[PDB]
Design a protein around this nucleic acid. Structure first.
Ligand SMILES: [Mg+2]
Ligand SMILES: [Mg+2]
Ligand SMILES: [Mg+2]
Ligand SMILES: [Mg+2]
Ligand SMILES: [Mg+2]
Ligand SMILES: [Mg+2]
Ligand SMILES: [Mg+2]
Ligand SMILES: [Mg+2]
Ligand SMILES: [Mg+2]
Ligand SMILES: [Mg+2]
Ligand SMILES: [Mg+2]
Ligand SMILES: [Mg+2]
Ligand SMILES: [Mg+2]
Ligand SMILES: [Mg+2]
Ligand SMILES: [Mg+2]
Ligand SMILES: [Mg+2]
Ligand SMILES: [Mg+2]
Ligand SMILES: [Mg+2]
Ligand SMILES: [Mg+2]
Ligand SMILES: [Mg+2]
Ligand SMILES: [Mg+2]
Ligand SMILES: [Mg+2]
Ligand SMILES: [Mg+2]
Ligand SMILES: [Mg+2]
Ligand SMILES: [Mg+2]
Ligand SMILES: [Mg+2]
Ligand SMILES: [Mg+2]
Ligand SMILES: [Mg+2]
Ligand SMILES: [Mg+2]
Ligand SMILES: [Mg+2]
Ligand SMILES: [Mg+2]
Ligand SMILES: [Mg+2]
Ligand SMILES: [Mg+2]
Ligand SMILES: [Mg+2]
Ligand SMILES: [Mg+2]
Lengths: 209, 97
RNA sequence: GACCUAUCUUUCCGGCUCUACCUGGCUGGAGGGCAGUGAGAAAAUGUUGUGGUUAGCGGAAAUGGCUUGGGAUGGCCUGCCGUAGACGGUGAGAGCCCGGUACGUGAAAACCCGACGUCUGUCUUGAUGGUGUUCCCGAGUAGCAGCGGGCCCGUGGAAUCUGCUGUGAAUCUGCCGGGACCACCCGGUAAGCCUGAAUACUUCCCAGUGACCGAUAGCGGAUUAGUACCGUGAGGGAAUGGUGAAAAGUACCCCGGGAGGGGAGUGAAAGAGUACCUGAAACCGUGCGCUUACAAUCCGUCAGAGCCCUCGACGUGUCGUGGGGUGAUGGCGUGCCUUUUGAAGAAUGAGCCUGCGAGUCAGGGACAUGUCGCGAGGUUAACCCGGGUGGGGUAGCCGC
RNA sequence: GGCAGCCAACGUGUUGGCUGGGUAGGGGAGCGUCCUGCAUCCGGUGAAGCCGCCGAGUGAUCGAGUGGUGGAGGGUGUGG
């Protein structure tokens, strides 16, 4: 168990959250995380690359000239692969790259990534990114600057907190995610993870229950 | 375009940066203006011998409308509710131009 | 279910059914419900919805300093906006210069989706028993037979479904299915009809995306492209993108009939001149160095005289831990590939260069072998919910 | 005198013994090219490409070593 002290945008500490060992003390598994991350990038990849085979290229139905007597190499189609403008052999065709990674591997990879941040004290908890119901990037930038000076930050906010999300959205290195969408790639890409208290509790509850 | 024929503009980019001049003609289709005294070319008129100096068009994003206070200004718009008009305003002073 | 035949309950007003009286009907018009353009009947017609589509408009913040440069959007240093650091453009990497972006805002008209009315239908007596060798319950139909078709099922013991040709029933004790067939049970009620959603697709229109192509690629088609051109015809079917930031596209003079060039200009650059970015190779010239006309050469290799060039130390040239170019002369020496017992082979293929041209991809597929997770268990499929790559989903599957 | 494979002997990678012609073919380990996740660096004070020089590695090859040409992108590390 590691304790994260909840910071407020007014500069106060409101409370603590206790991190379960099961979720934030896991030993990092680099080979497992590598498989999970590459699988995620494979699923991102849209397979939309295509080429025409010798049957799909326009024309080419007729045998150009007689088999024998011309003194030229025999040819069956003007669209054979050796021809300029002919069909492509073993060229790209559209394909799905997604992988069916087991659930337990995906979950363990996320726990490993979050544990690595927790051990290095890179996990922060906050009541709100901004006070009130008016988005302000200036407030959020100042407050995040007090929390972390690193460039890339993963901000985990509940669905409802539109004003917090909008307030941080435009900052260059900041990435915003909901706690139910938390994933290894975005955690390992971030220098620091900043949780809304509601989002951190929601994540702990859905897992440790 | 937000710059019009007859406006006075300050050049903000190019060799003639800082030159004031008057918009002699506007080319909206290609976002260029011809400005008096700026971007002059040494053309070879061929007919009578001809080696004249003439203005060449400059990209409109290289000029800024000069406000009544002498200051180059981004232009925005107010609505005049009486006529439904849409009037150019200088974003520095809020005055019409 | 019809037909009978008890019982208990029920809006109002008619009108009719030869005459009253009971009593059945049938049919109007008032109260009241209950539906509606849909499968369940049809065609209309108002009002209304910051509901939608077909044009748009607004929209924060640097003329900031110094330096480089033709140009700053580069470097260095300050500040500002951000619900806007999407993507473009602008004289070179721009959130703050421009089109925009976030976010807001807007429709006279037409069209589309509603809601609400009119308007149109429809209903208004229902519950409750008994009773019976009574009537009805989709006929050229079912069934059956011959020859076929199709079903996991290729005629098979061949059911079920179905075409053509014959033959041809029962109305509930009926009839048809439960893989020949029979019996018994079970299921169902053929030979009338209609029916939304879950599913398939994209000529065309709108908004986007890419570990897709980038001019022999990508569509055949970035260039008048289904054009030129070929064919009587069906039909076949190409090739051709880049000046520069700006055309400022070279006034004028000189040689020449022009073409082309030389001065002079423009440009940061004409080592950018409409034959134009970069400008490889084959291939074709000019100049310089060495070499070669007594020689028999797979064209090179290892020794190597002489000459030319260059780098060191010394001195006038001469030597070195040298390095290059050429090379008299001596030794050695039978192309490459394919295919063959064996090819320099007088077997096959290649005139030359540049570019292109061949073990790829899909599937919880199969066997094996690495690696990672979990482990007597492992795992989900479809699908559901997330603008994602995440969460859920036990049907299955594989071990036991 | 240099390199390599197998094995031994010990050590926190060196020493020794043996071995290293090769077509079909099997196994192992690498070079160069492009597109990309992430991290870093160079570039109008001149990137790529191209032509050279001077050098480098056991090979594919290399040069964040340098001239010329050129005008806007490129390198490196670790993964896909
Ligand atoms: Mg076609
Ligand atoms: Mg064909
Ligand atoms: Mg054929
Ligand atoms: Mg092609
Ligand atoms: Mg899943
Ligand atoms: Mg700058
Ligand atoms: Mg941009
Ligand atoms: Mg019937
Ligand atoms: Mg059959
Ligand atoms: Mg039967
Ligand atoms: Mg039908
Ligand atoms: Mg090209
Ligand atoms: Mg083409
Ligand atoms: Mg013919
Ligand atoms: Mg013709
Ligand atoms: Mg140049
Ligand atoms: Mg040419
Ligand atoms: Mg050229
Ligand atoms: Mg001689
Ligand atoms: Mg001889
Ligand atoms: Mg001999
Ligand atoms: Mg033979
Ligand atoms: Mg052989
Ligand atoms: Mg031969
Ligand atoms: Mg021969
Ligand atoms: Mg032969
Ligand atoms: Mg030949
Ligand atoms: Mg050894
Ligand atoms: Mg060997
Ligand atoms: Mg040997
Ligand atoms: Mg072999
Ligand atoms: Mg390279
Ligand atoms: Mg320059
Ligand atoms: Mg490149
Ligand atoms: Mg690789």
């Amino acid at each position: 168990t590691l304790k994260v002290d909840v910071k407020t945008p007014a500069g106060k500490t409101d409370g603590s959250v206790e991190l379960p060992a099961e979720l934030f003390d896991v030993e990092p598994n680099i080979a497992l995380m590598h498989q999970v991350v590459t699988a995620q990038l494979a699923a991102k990849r849209q397979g939309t690359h295509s080429t025409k085979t010798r049957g799909e290229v326009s024309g080419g139905g007729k045998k150009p000239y007689r088999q024998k007597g011309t003194g030229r190499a025999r040819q069956g189609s003007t669209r054979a692969p050796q021809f300029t403008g002919g069909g492509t052999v073993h060229g790209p065709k559209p394909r799905d790259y997604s992988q069916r990674t087991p659930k337990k591997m995906i979950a363990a990879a996320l726990r490993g990534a979050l544990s690595d941040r927790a051990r290095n004290d890179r996990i922060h908890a906050v009541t709100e990114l901004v006070e009130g119901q008016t988005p302000s990037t200036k407030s959020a930038k100042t407050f995040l600057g007090t929390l972390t000076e690193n460039k890339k930050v993963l901000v985990v906010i509940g669905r409802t907190d539109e004003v917090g999300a909008k307030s941080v959205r435009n900052l260059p290195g900041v990435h915003v995610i909901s706690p139910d969408q938390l994933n290894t790639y975005d955690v390992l890409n971030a220098d620091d993870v900043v949780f809304s208290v509601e989002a951190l509790n929601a994540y702990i509850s859905a897992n440790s229950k | 375009m937000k710059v019009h024929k007859g406006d006075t503009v300050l050049v903000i980019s190019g060799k003639d940066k800082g030159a004031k001049g008057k918009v002699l003609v506007a080319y909206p289709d290609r976002n260029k203006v011809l400005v008096e005294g700026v971007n002059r070319i040494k053309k070879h008129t061929a007919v009578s011998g001809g080696i004249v100096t003439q203005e060449a068009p400059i990209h409109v994003s290289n000029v800024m409308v000069v406000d009544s206070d002498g200051k180059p200004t981004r232009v925005g718009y107010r609505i005049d509710d009486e006529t439904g008009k849409k009037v150019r305003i200088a974003k520095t002073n809020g005055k019409d131009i």
